[PDB]
Design a protein around this ligand. Structure first.
Ligand SMILES: [K+]
Lengths: 71, 71, 82, 124, 105, 88
RNA sequence: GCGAGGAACCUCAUUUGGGAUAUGGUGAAAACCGUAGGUGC
RNA sequence: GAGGACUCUACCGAGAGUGGAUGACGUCAAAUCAGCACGGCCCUUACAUCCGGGGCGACCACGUGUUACAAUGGAGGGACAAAGGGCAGCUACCGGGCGACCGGAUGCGAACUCUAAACCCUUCCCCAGUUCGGAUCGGAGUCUGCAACUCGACUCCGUGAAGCUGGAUUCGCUAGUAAUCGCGCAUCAGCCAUGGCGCGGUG
């Protein structure tokens, strides 16, 4: 896992877009979901499509690419 | 006070002729590569690269390929 | 016996404590050291005070059975719902 | 002072200093009964002394390299040639039992294309 | 090669036959334990003489000795038991008594 | 092989050498919300060791900087100083 | 258990999409904005 | 100060060798245009070129291996003594730590630093799918790296699967050899390394 000395890996641009916020498209598959994301529609790239994800409190703490299969 | 001269090369005759001496143990490296340029494994040949070192001392006070350290 | 489980009496304690769902060999050794019981005598050769100490060490700080099964099943169900 | 000899067996070199005394074999600043706790290993090292001579010599041995069977066999060879220096009439008594001959067998190098020296991969 | 306790090359050859995996002192210990058990349980002559008589009870003479030792070891492995020496002692006593699945097999 | 491979390798080396100071300054401290603002090419993790002349990215040797086939060629040709062929 | 004796990004040739042929702002990045080559046969 | 090491020379059975490399002598239209050059053809508003995000890792048959299926054994506690090869990286020593290694410091660009296990004693297990086995899955973390979801390694705590020595057939060798036990290196930020290349113990 990611070491606690570094903290969570949240993409700064995606976090800024969510805080300033419609479905938000992104390629940040390795971004960790933060509690501020809850209640938002994030369309994650998967290789050829943008799978939409509605963020709920249960998903907090998981990478955004876990809810968008590639194969 | 003393001066120590350490010679080192890759040719024993060359260092022996250069040093006008305690003989230090040699450093022999062995490289193993595939004879073929493609999938044909199990056919290998060995290339040896040797380093010969000599030490001399002068108490109270060269061909190419030899490096000499004076201390 | 000890907690909902009847251990094999003839076995030594440090291996007979592994028959509970939440305890392995290392947890058994740790619990024996914490309760001060030797790891050589059998389960049958336990005083009531020794058994009470072992039971109190097991409780209030360990998930053993029933609760552990419910927690594992809840985690599996949450992962499935994910 | 001390009759000197050397023995080699695999990657193990033994040095012997045999002086007049009463037993008391010391190896690497340690007693022979505590350095080699196996009775087979003590029988190999003290073999040529019993063949001819024990309880009449004090022996100090320095060992380096190899394992316990390599060192014990190397130590036996060193003692065997040290006894022939003390008396030239003891040579046939030691060669007949096969003690002065050095065994030159060492671990063979691993050839390429094979997992071991003479072991080949399974073809099928 | 001399035996470490008895000084007979036949004992060394038998231990060589017994040897597994390159471990020779283990085979020596097994043989000596079996020779001790053959005297502790049952048991005339010494353990070494009893073992030699059992080998005789069980073509070049060297080949005969080798096949006798191999047969004795094979049937010792075949018979049941927990400790290998505890097993093998039964083969020595049974070959001395001239019976069992080992004899004439 | 190819030419775009070598061109982008040289570009990566140039960017890494350009940004080698600020990245170390940010890594020595605890800063990570700004360490992700550096371009991905600037990190030294995208630096493969290609052959110096042919450009083969496999079979690389660190001592000489050449692949195994090129090494055998030059060792047979005598171009590499010191390296000989074992008689055994 | 091979070219491969180091496929998370790079390697990478394969697929989808966006480009071109000093500071800001817009961008996932490339990039934008104002003040000969082929790892093709 | 010369018994070993280490590295230079000279003789070596007519009397009481081995391992490896050389391969004039070869046929397969055998393999290699993707190591590298190169005759011909085909791409230039794209088969050229830059970048993000995916794939090469998705799920029955064959080959090559690693663990086992256990008492010539597993566990716990003590005693052992190797050859070769690496070190801008390994690390002497003090403590935060259960542990992976972090945080202060010390030598070392190399006859200062990483190298044993199988063995030898003592005790438990006593034939049980077990104190055998270690697959799979849940939780906590430690690293590397901008980033570990697809898709890394390692360390703790649980969970504990098939597996009771394997039919027809078939593979490897003739001695420091098979069978075993550990150690090291190449590429490499990390690593899938149970692979490849070597080194020694007992035998
Ligand atoms: K790399």
């Amino acid at each position: 896992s990611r070491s606690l000395k570094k903290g969570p890996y949240i993409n700064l641009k995606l976090e800024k877009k969510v805080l300033a916020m419609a479905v938000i498209k992104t390629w940040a598959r390795a971004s960790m979901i933060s509690p501020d994301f809850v209640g938002h529609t994030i369309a994650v790239h998967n290789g050829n499509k943008f799978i939409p994800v509605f963020v709920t409190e249960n998903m907090v703490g998981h990478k955004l690419g876990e809810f968008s299969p590639t194969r | 006070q003393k001066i120590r001269i350490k010679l080192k090369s890759y040719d024993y005759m060359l260092v022996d002729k250069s040093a006008e001496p305690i003989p230090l143990p040699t450093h022999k490296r062995i490289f193993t590569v595939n004879r073929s340029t493609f999938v044909n494994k199990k056919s290998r040949e060995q290339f040896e690269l040797s380093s010969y070192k000599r030490l001399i001392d002068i108490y109270n006070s060269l061909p190419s390929g030899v490096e000499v350290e004076i201390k | 016996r000890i907690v909902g489980v009847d251990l094999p009496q003839n076995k030594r304690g440090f291996i007979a404590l592994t028959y509970i769902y939440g305890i392995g060999r290392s947890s058994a050794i740790t619990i024996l050291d914490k309760a001060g019981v030797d790891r050589d005598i059998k389960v049958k050769d336990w005083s009531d005070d020794q058994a009470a100490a072992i039971r109190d060490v097991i409780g209030a700080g360990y998930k053993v059975e029933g609760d552990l099964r419910s927690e594992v099943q809840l985690n599996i169900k949450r992962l499935m719902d994910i | 002072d001390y009759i000197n000899a050397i023995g080699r067996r695999k990657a193990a070199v033994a040095r012997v200093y045999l002086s007049e005394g009463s037993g008391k074999i010391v190896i690497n600043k340690r007693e022979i009964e505590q350095y080699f706790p196996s009775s087979i290993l003590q029988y190999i090292v003290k073999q040529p002394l019993l063949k001819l001579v024990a309880a009449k010599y004090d022996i100090k041995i320095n060992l380096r390299g190899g394992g316990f069977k390599g060192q014990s066999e190397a130590a036996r060879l060193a003692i065997a040639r040290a006894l022939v220096k003390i008396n030239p009439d003891d040579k046939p008594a030691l060669r007949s039992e096969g003690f002065i001959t050095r065994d030159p067998r060492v671990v063979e190098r691993k050839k390429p294309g094979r997992p071991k020296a003479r072991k080949r991969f399974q073809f099928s | 090669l001399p035996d470490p306790v008895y000084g007979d090359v036949r004992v060394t050859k038998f231990v060589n036959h017994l040897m597994y995996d390159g471990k020779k002192n283990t085979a020596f210990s097994i043989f000596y334990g079996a020779l001790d058990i053959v005297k502790t349980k049952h048991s005339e002559k010494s353990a070494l003489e009893i073992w030699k008589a059992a080998l005789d009870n069980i073509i070049r003479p060297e080949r005969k000795e080798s096949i006798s030792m191999k047969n004795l070891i094979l049937y010792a492995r075949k018979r049941g038991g927990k400790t290998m020496a505890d097993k093998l002692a039964a083969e020595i006593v049974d070959a001395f008594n001239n019976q069992g699945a080992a004899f004439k097999r | 092989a190819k030419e775009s491979m070598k061109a982008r390798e040289v570009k990566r080396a140039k960017l890494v050498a350009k940004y080698a100071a600020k990245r170390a300054a940010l890594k020595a401290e605890g800063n990570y919300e700004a360490l992700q603002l550096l371009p991905k090419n600037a990190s030294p993790v995208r630096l493969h060791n290609r052959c110096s002349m042919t450009g083969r990215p496999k079979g690389y040797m660190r001592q000489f900087g050449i692949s195994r086939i090129q090494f055998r060629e030059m060792a047979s040709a005598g171009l590499i100083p010191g390296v000989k062929k074992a008689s055994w």
